[PDB]
């Protein structure tokens, strides 16, 4: 297993995590702070708890020494939280960024969606090929995601809520580099 290209350093801007949406006492610059919880005991997640689009995405965006950089990535983990309110996606799609525009930082990286933003355009983004995923989620644990290599400045995963839940929720992820 080599390089954690996800967590973030002190002091530099990048790697960086961005969600299209946040619950915002939940930012989703919690899903790389490399604190990892299933409770509340720290509370350590992002979520979509009770917003309004069912739909959002958790994103990293890559750097290297502290500026922006391409990274050469085939795996996601992503452990997933549940409460009474919040647990795994129904569905999902992860992707990675092929858009000709350079991206910059969000100015809000937990409400990109809320900003005029190249991670907004789903013409920046291809869904990854030959997914090896597990057959059910689980909330409680990281879920790990294979994929065959990309050469790109960003990853996301596009998640819909579960109908029973108010959202969506992760604790950490987790990207690798070869
Ligand atoms: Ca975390």
Redesign the pocket.
């Known amino acids: 297993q080599g390089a954690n290209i996800s967590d973030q350093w002190t002091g530099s801007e990048l790697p960086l995590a961005f969600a299209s949406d946040s619950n915002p006492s939940d930012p989703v610059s ?8 299933y409770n509340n005991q720290p509370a ?2 992002w979520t979509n708890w009770n917003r309004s689009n069912p739909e959002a995405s958790v994103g990293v965006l890559f750097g290297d020494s502290g500026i922006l950089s391409k990274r050469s990535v085939d795996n996601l983990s992503v452990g997933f939280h549940e409460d009474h309110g919040v647990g795994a996606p129904k569905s999902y799609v992860i992707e990675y960024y092929v858009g000709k525009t350079v991206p910059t930082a969000p100015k809000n990286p937990s409400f990109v969606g809320n900003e005029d933003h190249v991670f907004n355009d789903s013409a920046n983004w291809k869904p990854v090929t030959n997914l090896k995923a597990p057959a059910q989620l689980k909330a409680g644990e990281m879920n790990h995601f294979s994929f065959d290599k990309v050469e790109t400045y960003a990853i996301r995963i596009r998640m819909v809520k579960a109908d029973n839940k108010r959202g969506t929720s992760i ?2 992820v987790q990207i690798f580099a070869k």
């Open positions: 919690n899903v790389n702070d490399k604190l990892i919880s350590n997640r604790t950490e």
